Design a protein around this nucleic acid. Structure first.
Ligand SMILES: Nc1ccn([C@H]2C[C@H](O)[C@@H](COP(=O)(O)NP(=O)(O)OP(=O)(O)O)O2)c(=O)n1
Ligand SMILES: [Mn+2]
Ligand SMILES: [Mn+2]
Ligand code: NA
Ligand code: NA
Length: 326
DNA sequence: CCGACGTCGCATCAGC
DNA sequence: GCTGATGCGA
DNA sequence: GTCGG
């Protein structure tokens, strides 16, 4: 983290633009700049040095000059002082509360943690669970706990049906020493792009993880995606582990490589890779890579037998999971 | 200069 | 009820 | 907010 001060600054600008301004492309611009600067292997000494980097334009270069000369940015100094901004920015930290609801809550004079706790009846289910575990969801997960969680998820899934394959993705698969949550990719032979021979494939798994008190709460759930809450079991007289977010994605088994590419991330890596695909005239989702007809209309799914196959189509040298952390 | 900028799942609402 | 848009999230 | 064409 040679340039921690700069990337911190930009990320806070990105978060302001998303949460307060509701300007998503500015949020994306700041995040790209932050990402490209994070991996730049020199300590940056000027706005002009940084502007060489793609994603760093004129405006951000000027901010880096100010930041480097003073250690602060007056634009942020002011945002930090603004009641409305700070309130809105804070409320969005609760899972299920985004920019729209946070500004609406603020409009009704709900703007502190205490105000949320008194107005639980004004929250939807997701927001209510997010409020409940606000404290725990602030804490990161040590990789060592991630390994214990992996153990449990894989063994419980096996007990439901040995032909399930469960794969932990996200920052875990990228080798991170701590993660924000756990991401689990699920496949089963009965669910392919061509047919769903068995129903409740995700539900049965979720049910089992609840039965053993691993999954404690549900934020959302359908046939292919689960979002919820889980907790490691603790020992006698031990303090309980924090509750953790968990996401599960059931992917058609024949489309595992697109699915694991997607769920491994990072989010910025996926966005840049999909953008680059479009420049090369392909489109990538979690299921397929497809060519773009001169029209614009996507064509038929191309054969894919490895993650690398996907990289090969768009003329990118392969990158290991641990190197996709943009 | 200029829009053109990843892709999709589930919850909730509006309009019918 | 269904359809399609909006919010929030992966 | 950036920038390719
Ligand atoms: N905007 C987003 C968010 C998520 N992702 C897909 C890939 C991200 O790695 C991933 C899993 O989402 P995530 O859990 O929110 N982030 P990730 O696991 O990479 O890092 P953590 O903050 O969980 O440690 O899903 C995406 O493609 N676009
Ligand atoms: Mn994750
Ligand atoms: Mn996740
Ligand atoms: Na640049
Ligand atoms: Na939120």
């Amino acid at each position: 983290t040679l340039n921690g001060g700069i990337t911190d600054m930009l990320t806070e600008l990105a978060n302001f633009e998303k949460n307060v301004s509701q300007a998503i492309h500015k949020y994306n611009a700041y995040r790209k700049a932050a990402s490209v600067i994070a991996k730049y292997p020199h300590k940056i000494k000027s706005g002009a040095e940084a502007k060489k980097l793609p994603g760093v334009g004129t405006k951000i270069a000027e901010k880096i000059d100010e930041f480097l000369a003073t250690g602060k940015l007056r634009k942020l100094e002011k945002i930090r002082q603004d009641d409305t901004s700070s309130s809105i920015n804070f409320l969005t930290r609760v899972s299920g509360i985004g920019p729209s609801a946070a500004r609406k809550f603020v409009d009704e004079g709900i703007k502190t943690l205490e105000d949320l706790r008194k107005n639980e009846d004004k929250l939807n289910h997701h927001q209510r669970i997010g409020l409940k575990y606000f404290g725990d969801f602030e804490k990161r997960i040590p990789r060592e706990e991630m390994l214990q969680m992996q153990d449990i998820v894989l063994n419980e899934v096996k007990k439901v049906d040995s032909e399930y394959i469960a794969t932990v993705c996200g920052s875990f698969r990228r080798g991170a020493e701590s993660s924000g949550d756990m991401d689990v990719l699920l496949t089963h032979p009965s669910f392919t792009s061509e047919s769903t021979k068995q129903p409740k494939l995700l539900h049965q798994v979720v049910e089992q993880l609840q039965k053993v008190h691993f999954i404690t709460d549900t934020l959302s759930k359908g046939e292919t995606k689960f979002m919820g809450v889980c907790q490691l079991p603790s020992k006698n007289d031990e303090k309980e582990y924090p509750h953790r977010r968990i996401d599960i994605r059931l992917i058609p088994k024949d489309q595992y490589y697109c699915g694991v590419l997607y769920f491994t991330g990072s989010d910025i890596f996926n966005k840049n890779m999909r953008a680059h695909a479009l420049e090369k005239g392909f489109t990538i989702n979690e299921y397929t890579i497809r060519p773009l007809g001169v029209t614009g209309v996507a064509g038929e799914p191309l054969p894919v037998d490895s993650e690398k196959d996907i990289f090969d189509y768009i003329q990118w040298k392969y990158r290991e999971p641990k190197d996709r952390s943009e």
